[PDB]
Amino acid sequence: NSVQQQLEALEKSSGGRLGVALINTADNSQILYRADERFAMCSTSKVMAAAAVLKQSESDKHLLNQRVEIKKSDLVNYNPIAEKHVNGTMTLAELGAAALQYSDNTAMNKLIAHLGGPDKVTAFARSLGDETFRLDRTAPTLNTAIPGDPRDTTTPLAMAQTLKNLTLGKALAETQRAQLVTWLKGNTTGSASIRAGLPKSWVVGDKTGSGDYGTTNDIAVIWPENHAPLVLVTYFTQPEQKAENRNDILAAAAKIVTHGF
């Protein structure tokens, strides 16, 4: 079976819908599966919000250290870092780190509020040439992941292209690019997702997402030991609202598409 056959078979066995885009930066080749179809991003959208703040910081040397007050009323469904800082402050940099490395939903909301709302995140994506990304809601409602709902969606290929631009390319100034990469590499939430399908010693930066409809996502940049980087988006969603999330499917997809590399 070819790689395409392998992916189709994975989806068939999955009980849902799998979206994969891998970009091999060695030769600009791609491994694409439903890559122009829309999926709910869930918390993978946090990369775009953090990057939008990094872009602003290029032209404001005080931005990343700007204090943001954290209140009990800011707490939502999942906020392991922000809850430690109630009655105190976190900087915008600390909010970026918490959003990306712990998937702190309060931190995401502070980034969105700072930027001026979800539509400002969409505008930032558009500024990078991403015609597909849209952010419509704050956390946690951006994770409803209802089949066919266009809110808070993108396609695997659009997200792979933009993640490449953000981390390895044309989107950010060098210090800010490096900061985004540092954040992604230090993610704590991705052990069982793309990372689990790769050689243990490969360096990886990623951002996960999980939502309703068993929606289970991960977006990654991967640095092999002897090869150019790979950029990989694995999105997965299921037909029933209360389906279990399935990080194992993402690991399995990663293993399939990184074979040989």
Ligand X SMILES: *C(=O)[C@@H](NC(=O)/C(=N\OC)c1csc(N)n1)[C@@H]1N=C(C(=O)O)C(=C)CS1
Q: Is 43 noted as a catalytic residue in this protein?
A: yes
**What is the rounded distance in angstroms from the CA atom of residue 51 to the CA atom of residue 58?**
11
What are the structure tokens assigned to 214, written together?
Answer: 């068993």
Contact 109, 115 (CB under 8 A): no
Q: Which range, of 148-156, 205-213, 220-228, 235-243, touches ligand X by CB under 6 A?
A: 205-213
3-state secondary structure of 170: coil
Would you say 144 is a known binding-site residue?
Answer: no
**Interaction with ligand X in 59-88: which residues (CB under 6 A)?**
77-78
Binding status of residue 187 toward ligand X by CB under 6 A: no
Please give the residues from 110 up to 169 whose contact with ligand X meets the rule CB under 6 A: 140, 143
Catalytic residue, from 14, 43, 45, 57: name it: 43
Which residue number is nearest to ligand X in terms of Cβ?
A: 43
Q: What span, in angstroms and rounded, lies between the C-alpha atoms of 235 and 19? A: 5
Tell me how far, at minimum, the Cβ of 94 lies from ligand X, in Å.
Answer: 17
Task: Tell me the two tokens of residue 215.
Answer: 């929606």
**Which of residues 31 and 205 has its CB atom nearest to ligand X in the complex?**
205
Tokens 């952010």 belong to which residue?
135
Choose the binding region for ligand X from 15-23, 114-122, 164-172, 207-215 (rule: CB under 6 A): 207-215
Does the protein bind ligand X through residue 96 (CB under 6 A)?
no
Residue 237 CB partners (closer than 8 Å, separation 6+):
16, 17, 39, 40, 145, 147, 213, 214, 215, 216
What are the residues binding ligand X (CB under 6 A)?
42-43, 77-78, 103, 105, 140, 143, 189, 208-212, 245
